[PDB]
Amino acid sequence: KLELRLKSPVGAEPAVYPWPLPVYDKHHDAAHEIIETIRWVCEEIPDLKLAMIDYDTKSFESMQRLCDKYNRAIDSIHQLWKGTTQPMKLNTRPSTGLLRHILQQVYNHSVTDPEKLNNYEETSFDLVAQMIDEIKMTDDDLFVDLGSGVGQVVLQVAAATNCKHHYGVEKADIPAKYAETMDREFRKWMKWYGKKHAEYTLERGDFLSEEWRERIANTSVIFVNNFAFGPEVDHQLKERFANMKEGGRIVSSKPFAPLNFRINSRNLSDIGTIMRVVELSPLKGSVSWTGKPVSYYLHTIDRTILENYFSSLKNPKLREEQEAAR
Ligand SMILES: CC(C)(C)c1ccc(NC(=O)NCCCNC[C@H]2O[C@@H](n3cc(Br)c4c(N)ncnc43)[C@H](O)[C@@H]2O)cc1
């Protein structure tokens, strides 16, 4: 019963892999997960990087010597920390690079049968990462991913921000089931690397439900991957966003209002009367399954647009101009 073990850099239980090393899917396997874990612990601790592809992933002896050599170096770093050298700060957030590794790792150990999940169908990782940098978030914020799937986006944002809470809501059974495991695997692996995350919850639910009406209303940052949603769903979401508070934000893959919205007597009731909508800077090189470069849209709840329209109706000069155009 042959095995490979990697020690945690902060003394959690070791990662143990059987030999021969499992394959996770067409592009991922345990051997590369091991190599990349070592790579990433080395980025996490430069003394280790100091001490550390001429390796044969199909040879037990070659892979055992890699793991033994990492494990020795870890022991020696733990000794160094007992001395005068300061240990690695705990309670930090993972870098974007490490987080990407962690999420792949969590996925590798959580979604055993990809196929079961495919029948409900991560360049998104980079897009979300850009959004985390642009959309400033604080501990006043509540975050939701509407239609969260197996939960990856919620995990990523929770690892990276100070929002008071992060939620994902998913209706379908397969993805909700896998999210429970993703959650367990995520907490285990974040502990393994010694890294912190903000609070989060993954839930089974319908975000168009009556419970979610009030919850949407109290959320300050919503992400929603709506490009492929149909008009009735989008229409129903527009109605839930109408109760959001001023400064609330929605980031989506298809805008919920025209980018050039001109308020007038016929469109007074439209969601565009209460939000600024902008097309966000796209990430060079990122392209959708449609071939085009990706785009995403930021909506900010701003009721001063509506206020100014009403004020303008009181001004006979402005009222005439408006009336003459339309
Ligand atoms: C814009 C940026 C780039 C920032 C951005 C990038 C990514 C994200 N977020 C994600 O990709 N999340 C995971 C994949 C999308 N989820 C599809 C899931 O929706 C579920 N769903 C549908 C209804 Br309709 C639905 C519902 N009514 N109630 C609950 N779940 C629902 C459906 O069962 C699928 O499992 C958000 C923003």
Atom of ligand 1 minimally distant from the CA of 127? 3
Identical fold at 1-118 and 125-326? no
Say what the resolution is, in angstroms.
Answer: 2.2
Determine if ligand 1 sits within 6 Å of the CB of residue 117: no
Distance CA 260, CA 74 (A): 57
For residue 306, the one-letter residue type is L
Method: X-ray
- DSSP result, 245-291: PTT-EEEESS-SS-SS----TTSTTSGGGGEEEEEPPP-TT-B-TTS
7 Rama class: left (phi>0) / alpha (psi -120 to 50) / beta:
beta
Distance CA 260, CA 278 (A): 9
Ligand 1 geometric centre to CA of 191 (Å): 27
Largest CA distance in the chain: 87
For residues 73 and 149, is the Cβ–Cβ distance under 8 A? no
CA of 151 to the centre of ligand 1 (A): 9
Cα 159 to Cα 197: distance, rounded to the nearest angstrom = 4
Does 226 sit in the ligand 1 pocket, CB within 6 Å?
Answer: no
| Residues 271/241, Cβ–Cβ less than 8 Å | yes
Instruction: Identify the residue whose tokens are 């969601």.
Output: 271
| Residue 188 per-residue DSSP state | H
In the reported structure, the alpha carbon of residue 223 is separated from the centroid of ligand 1 by a whole-number distance in angstroms of: 8
Q: Would you tell me how many other CB atoms lie within 10 Å of the CB of residue 199?
A: 10
CB of 127 closer than 6 A to ligand 1? Answer: yes
Ligand 1 lined by 156 (C-beta under 6 Å): no
Return all residues near 91 (Cβ < 8 A) that are at least 6 apart.
196
282 phi/psi in degrees, rounded to 5? -85, 160
Q: How is the chain split into domains, by residue range?
A: 1-118, 125-326
Q: Are 190 and 106 in contact (CB under 8 A)?
A: no
24 closest CA partner among 121, 113, 153, 103: 113
Q: How far is the CA of 26 from the centre of ligand 1 (A)?
A: 25
167 lines ligand 1 (CB under 6 A): no
**What are the strands of the beta sheet with 142-146, ordered from one edge?**
200-204, 165-170, 142-146, 221-224, 249-252, 297-301, 275-279
The verdict on the CB of residue 255 being under 6 Å from ligand 1 is no
Find the Cα–Cα–Cα–Cα dihedral 296, 132, 170, 286, rounded to 10°.
40
Name the amino acid, one letter, at 29. Answer: D
Contact 183, 206 (CB under 8 A): no
Annotated binding-site positions for S-adenosyl-L-methionine: 122-123, 143-152, 170, 206-207
Task: Supply the DSSP string of 147-163, one letter for each residue.
Answer: S-TTSHHHHHHHHH---
Other Cβ atoms less than 10 A from the Cβ of 317: the count is 8
Residue 224 CA to ligand 1 center (angstroms) comes to: 6
Closest C-alpha residue for ligand 1 atom 19: 147
How crowded is the C-beta side of 157, counted as CA atoms within 13 Å?
33
User: For residues 40, 46, 47 and 49, what is the CA-based torsion angle, rounded to 10 degrees?
Assistant: 50
Report the binding-site residues: 122-123, 143-152, 170, 206-207
Query: Is the distance from the beta carbon of residue 130 to the nearest atom of ligand 1 less than 6 Å?
Result: no
**Cα–Cα distance, 174 to 169 (Å, whole number):** 13
User: Which one-letter DSSP state was computed for residue 136?
Assistant: -
Q: Cα 178 to chain center, whole Å?
A: 16
Task: With beta carbons less than 8 A apart as the criterion, state whether 135 and 298 touch.
Answer: yes
Q: Where are the alpha helices (DSSP H) in 135-246?
A: 152-160, 173-193, 210-217, 231-241
Residue type, 10: V
Fold of 1-118: 434 Repressor (Amino-terminal Domain) (1.10.260)
> Secondary structure of the chain: what % helix, strand, coil (to 5)?
45, 15, 40
CATH number for the region 125-326 comes to 3.40.50.150
Residue with the two structure tokens 């903000």: 198
Three-class secondary structure of residue 167 per DSSP: strand
Number of helices and strands in the chain (H, E): 12, 11
Which two structure tokens, joined as six digits, stand for 280? Answer: 């966000």
Is 14 strand, coil or helix?
A: coil
20 upstream amide cis, omega within 30 of 0? yes
Contacts 24+ apart (CB under 8 A), 204-210: 204/169, 204/170, 204/171, 204/173, 204/176, 205/169, 205/170, 205/171, 206/169, 206/171, 207/146, 207/147, 207/169, 207/171, 207/237, 207/240, 208/233, 208/236, 208/237, 208/240
Helix or strand (DSSP H, E) at 165: strand 165-170
Nearest CA to ligand 1 atom 7: 225
What span, in angstroms and rounded, lies between the C-alpha atoms of 220 and 135? 11
Q: What span, in angstroms and rounded, lies between the C-alpha atoms of 157 and 153?
A: 6
Residues 6+ apart with CB under 8 A from 15: 5, 6, 8, 37, 192
Distance (Å, whole) CA 242 – CA 147: 19
Instruction: Out of 125, 130, 153, give the residue to mutate to test ligand 1, the one with the largest number of ligand atoms within 8 Å of its CB.
Output: 153
